[PDB]
Design an enzyme around this catalytic site. Structure first.
Site, PDB file in Angstrom:
ATOM      1  N   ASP A 281       0.862  -1.183   0.000  1.00  8.89           N
ATOM      2  CA  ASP A 281       0.000   0.000   0.000  1.00  8.89           C
ATOM      3  C   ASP A 281       0.897   1.231   0.000  1.00  8.89           C
ATOM      4  O   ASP A 281       0.948   1.995   0.984  1.00  8.89           O
ATOM      5  CB  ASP A 281      -0.945   0.009   1.212  1.00  8.89           C
ATOM      6  CG  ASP A 281      -2.098   0.991   1.041  1.00  8.89           C
ATOM      7  OD1 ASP A 281      -2.101   1.703   0.015  1.00  8.89           O
ATOM      8  OD2 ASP A 281      -2.990   1.054   1.919  1.00  8.89           O
TER       9      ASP A 281
HETATM   10  N1  LIG Z   1     -10.692   0.287   1.429  1.00  2.00           N
HETATM   11  C1  LIG Z   1      -9.513   0.584   2.273  1.00  2.00           C
HETATM   12  C2  LIG Z   1      -8.407   1.304   1.461  1.00  2.00           C
HETATM   13  O1  LIG Z   1      -8.898   2.573   0.991  1.00  2.00           O
HETATM   14  C3  LIG Z   1      -7.909   3.405   0.273  1.00  2.00           C
HETATM   15  O2  LIG Z   1      -7.472   2.671  -0.858  1.00  2.00           O
HETATM   16  C4  LIG Z   1      -8.325   2.832  -2.013  1.00  2.00           C
HETATM   17  C5  LIG Z   1      -7.910   4.079  -2.835  1.00  2.00           C
HETATM   18  O3  LIG Z   1      -7.993   5.259  -2.009  1.00  2.00           O
HETATM   19  C6  LIG Z   1      -8.804   4.275  -4.079  1.00  2.00           C
HETATM   20  O4  LIG Z   1      -8.464   5.437  -4.917  1.00  2.00           O
HETATM   21  C7  LIG Z   1      -8.915   6.721  -4.503  1.00  2.00           C
HETATM   22  O5  LIG Z   1      -7.907   7.342  -3.684  1.00  2.00           O
HETATM   23  C8  LIG Z   1      -6.620   7.547  -4.318  1.00  2.00           C
HETATM   24  C9  LIG Z   1      -5.723   8.284  -3.349  1.00  2.00           C
HETATM   25  O6  LIG Z   1      -5.593   7.457  -2.196  1.00  2.00           O
HETATM   26  C10 LIG Z   1      -6.783   8.436  -5.530  1.00  2.00           C
HETATM   27  O7  LIG Z   1      -5.521   8.553  -6.158  1.00  2.00           O
HETATM   28  C11 LIG Z   1      -7.723   7.767  -6.504  1.00  2.00           C
HETATM   29  N2  LIG Z   1      -7.944   8.693  -7.629  1.00  2.00           N
HETATM   30  C12 LIG Z   1      -9.037   7.573  -5.790  1.00  2.00           C
HETATM   31  O8  LIG Z   1      -9.977   6.939  -6.670  1.00  2.00           O
HETATM   32  C13 LIG Z   1      -8.681   3.053  -4.929  1.00  2.00           C
HETATM   33  N3  LIG Z   1      -9.605   3.286  -6.052  1.00  2.00           N
HETATM   34  C14 LIG Z   1      -9.043   1.784  -4.124  1.00  2.00           C
HETATM   35  C15 LIG Z   1      -8.153   1.605  -2.923  1.00  2.00           C
HETATM   36  N4  LIG Z   1      -8.628   0.431  -2.168  1.00  2.00           N
HETATM   37  C16 LIG Z   1      -6.720   3.616   1.194  1.00  2.00           C
HETATM   38  O9  LIG Z   1      -5.712   4.351   0.481  1.00  2.00           O
HETATM   39  C17 LIG Z   1      -6.144   2.289   1.679  1.00  2.00           C
HETATM   40  O10 LIG Z   1      -5.048   2.575   2.541  1.00  2.00           O
HETATM   41  C18 LIG Z   1      -7.246   1.541   2.426  1.00  2.00           C
HETATM   42  O11 LIG Z   1      -6.758   0.293   2.911  1.00  2.00           O
END
Ligand SMILES: NC[C@H]1O[C@H](O[C@H]2[C@H](O)[C@@H](O[C@H]3O[C@H](CO)[C@@H](O)[C@H](N)[C@H]3O)[C@H](N)C[C@@H]2N)[C@H](O)[C@@H](O)[C@@H]1O
Ligand SMILES: CC(C)(C)n1nc(Cc2cccc3ccccc23)c2c(N)ncnc21
Ligand SMILES: [Cl-]
Ligand code: NA
Ligand code: NA
Length: 272
Positions: free
Chosen positions: A199
């Site tokens: 991550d």
């Molecule tokens: N469910 C729990 C998880 O949630 C987030 O992860 C998600 C991302 O956030 C998503 O993306 C969005 O956020 C990004 C910045 O973080 C942006 O660049 C992007 N444009 C956005 O669409 C991506 N689609 C899925 C991913 N699982 C956390 O980061 C992660 O630590 C945590 O475990």
């Protein structure tokens, strides 16, 4: 020599370990992840001549999660700057992880505070990621390969745990099952396996005094394709600019980004 040795001697009780209710003594307290997925988190601060600490408490399945981060912290710290484990306790339904805090701000916060330094910041991120991916895989006891992760993703999907509201723009409002199906059309490809973080986002890398001084949240650490980390970080940089996205690859050392592997790993992260 001699085998099947099972020799018993009488002994007194050994000297047992100093308890948890001791390390944490004179500190302030604060829950920092209210309403999130995972452990209760306590920030311990305000002790004279003592560093700041975090204490994660996982119950049930979350205790397995905290246990997972602990062993990965323990292993990876020989190679990378991580929080140090002060104390860890596992009981049948609970895990408690006490770690030192890494002083500083996240890469996200630093990018926001220092927008004119975006290019220098991405350079620092690429150097740090290159360092991680330079750990010889023969040293790593953890498996995070795509077969393993795909099975975890299938499970989350079937248990209704996928956050469908949080898909990237290009998959906005897609049913989870459509993401699953289209993702499998990118397979197979040959993995270029390295030690990955799992991550590698802007929230999980810490800067202090202008330098990248550590990473946190290492529960998914293990051997996987290098794009596992490149994809997640590239995605985050999109909140800033496509030039910075491009720069990540260039400075990491990839002139010709594999769009298929990039897409695959972005899609895989949708399930987590
Ligand atoms: N469910 C729990 C998880 O949630 C987030 O992860 C998600 C991302 O956030 C998503 O993306 C969005 O956020 C990004 C910045 O973080 C942006 O660049 C992007 N444009 C956005 O669409 C991506 N689609 C899925 C991913 N699982 C956390 O980061 C992660 O630590 C945590 O475990
Ligand atoms: C425990 C875990 C969530 C993995 N974590 N988080 C951080 C970031 C961070 C930095 C500064 C203040 C914070 C306040 C609330 C939440 C996080 C904070 C962090 C860190 N610096 N050092 C060690 N672990 C950290
Ligand atoms: Cl561009
Ligand atoms: Na270390
Ligand atoms: Na994106």
């Amino acid at each position: 020599g001699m085998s099947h040795i099972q020799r018993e001697t009488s002994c007194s009780r050994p000297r047992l370990n100093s308890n948890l209710d001791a390390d944490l003594y004179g500190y302030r307290w604060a829950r920092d992840n209210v309403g999130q997925s995972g452990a209760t988190i306590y920030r311990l601060y305000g002790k004279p001549n003592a560093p700041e600490l975090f204490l994660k408490h996982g119950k049930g399945s979350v205790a397995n999660d905290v246990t997972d981060e602990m062993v990965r912290l323990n292993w990876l710290t020989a190679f990378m700057p991580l929080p140090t484990i002060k104390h860890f306790i596992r009981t049948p339904d609970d895990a408690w992880l006490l770690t030192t805090a890494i002083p500083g701000k996240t890469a996200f916060q630093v990018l926001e505070e220092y927008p004119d330094s975006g290019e220098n910041i991405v350079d620092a991120l690429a150097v740090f990621l290159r360092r991680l991916h330079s750990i010889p895989v023969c040293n790593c006891p953890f498996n995070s390969d795509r077969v393993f992760r795909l099975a975890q993703a299938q499970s989350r999907m079937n248990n209704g745990l996928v956050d469908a509201s949080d898909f990237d723009d290009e998959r906005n409002g897609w049913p989870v099952e459509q993401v699953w199906k289209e993702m499998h059309k990118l397979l197979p490809f040959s993995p270029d396996s390295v030690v990955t973080h799992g991550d590698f986002s802007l929230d999980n890398l810490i800067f202090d005094e202008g330098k990248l001084i550590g990473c946190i949240d290492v529960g998914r650490v293990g051997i996987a394709d290098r794009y596992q980390d490149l994809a997640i970080l590239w995605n985050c940089l999109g909140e800033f600019s496509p030039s910075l996205q491009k720069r990540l690859f260039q400075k990491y050392g990839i002139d010709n980004p594999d769009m298929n592997k990039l897409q695959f790993h972005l899609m895989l992260d949708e399930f987590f």
